């Protein structure tokens with residue numbers, strides 16, 4: 001049975017660069033997937049999408065649209081100390097949080113900084 005660490009590694013092995021917004025999306029898909037016992041269907045959708053010729057980036061997005069735990073779901077909140085805890089390759093993807101962010105519309109997560117600042121990571 002696939003673990004969350006295993007799934008993260010499989011997905012990472014298909015992504016170019018490191019610490020990009022897509023890497024963070026893998027983290028969120030894996031966390032939310034573990035918590036909803038859905039790692040197997042997520043892995044299956046990921047592989048099916050690649051097998052059809054989709055880019056791995058499109059495969060990750062398709063998961064947010066096809067797997068029901070992500071459908072019309074709010075992005076998870078992740079508490080951090082400062083913007084420095086976010087990878088360099090994510091920095092330009094950080095945005096002010098809109099009123100009703102949804103994962104399946106590209107809002108991967110919401111970082112909540114110690115001093116109260118809040119930033120959404122957008123794909």
Ligand SMILES: Cc1ccc(N2C(=O)C(O)=C(C(=O)c3ccccc3)[C@@H]2c2cc(Br)cs2)cc1C(=O)O
Nearest residue numbers: 004024027028030031032034076078080085086109
């Ligand atoms: C199954 C799983 C997947 C990923 C993680 N994460 C980590 O251990 C971790 O460090 C995660 C991050 O994405 C992260 C990114 C930047 C700064 C801090 C955390 C990341 C998180 C995803 C979400 Br949604 C909340 S934390 C944790 C778990 C877990 O079981 O604790």
